[PDB]
């Protein structure tokens, strides 16, 4: 035929996806390695190219810890991602499904975490490898940042929180917790 | 105690 103009869309819905997305939404996008886990992205813009025609999506990349320069670390959550310097444009049909990037705080407040739920406490730099903020709060004797996956427990003099394994204690110890005092007290 | 449990 002949081609229609390019148009920026309020929203786009895909039959394969079966879900309808708008700008500002977070999505999972198939990487070229299909076995590889989905890329997490934030949709800045949706646009249709009349030539194809096809739909292009301007995405800002959310990096996984294992995609970061530093690599994954102990205090890094399973569903943790960093908002990154990296922008790209992808096909609309590379989208598997919608997802939610919560604030670290709101993620902590979540009753149950599904494969859809993620959290972000770090902004990220793709070239340098810088983090913003450069540091957060730390806890226990390991003096490491908090991983919401893991279980900690509070006390009195310290009123700090501890990994049981870090102090001989059981995973099972704190259930039967009349209460907690730690040596530093 | 602090934890967010993941189930689905
Ligand atoms: Zn203490
Ligand atoms: Zn610890």
Residue numbers in the entry:
A (entry chain A): 3 to 187
B (entry chain P): 3 to 10
How did the manuscript describe this experimental structure?
In Arabidopsis, the BAH and PHD dual domain-containing proteins SHORT LIFE (SHL) and EARLY BOLTING IN SHORT DAYS (EBS) function in chromatin-mediated floral repression and seed dormancy. Here, our biochemical and X-ray structural studies show that SHL is capable of recognizing an active histone mark H3K4me3 and a repressive mark H3K27me3 independently via its PHD and BAH domain, respectively. In this study, we identified SHL as a dual histone methyl-lysine reader that is distinct from other reader proteins in recognizing both H3K4me3 and H3K27me3, two well-known histone marks with opposing roles in balancing chromatin and transcriptional states. In contrast, the SHL from Populus trichocarpa (PtSHL), which has similar PHD and BAH domains and shows similar H3K4me3 and H3K27me3-binding affinities, successfully yielded crystals.
We determined the crystal structure of PtSHL-H3(1–15)K4me3 complex at 2.8 Å resolution. The peptide adopts an extended conformation and fits into a negatively charged surface cleft of the PHD finger of PtSHL. H3R2, H3K4me3, and H3T6 form additional hydrogen-bonding interactions with Gln156, Met154, and Pro150, respectively. Single amino acid substitution of the key residues involving PtSHL-H3K4me3 interaction either abolished or greatly reduced the binding to H3K4me3. Besides the PHD finger, the BAH domain has direct but not sequence-specific contacts with H3T6 to H3K9. The superposition of the two complexes yields an RMSD of 0.94 Å, suggesting a nearly identical overall structures. The distance between H3S10 (the last observed residue of the H3K4me3 peptide) and H3A21 (the first observed residue of the H3K27me3 peptide) is 26 Å. The binding between 2-fold excess H3(20–36)K27me3 peptide pre-saturated PtSHL and H3(1–15)K4me3 peptide yielded a binding affinity of 27.6 μM, similar to the binding affinity of 20.6 μM between PtSHL and H3(1–15)K4me3 peptide. The 1:1 stoichiometry coupled with an observation that there is no significant binding affinity difference between singly and doubly modified H3K4me3 and H3K27me3 peptides, suggest that the PHD-H3K4me3 and the BAH-H3K27me3 binding are independent events and mutually exclusive.
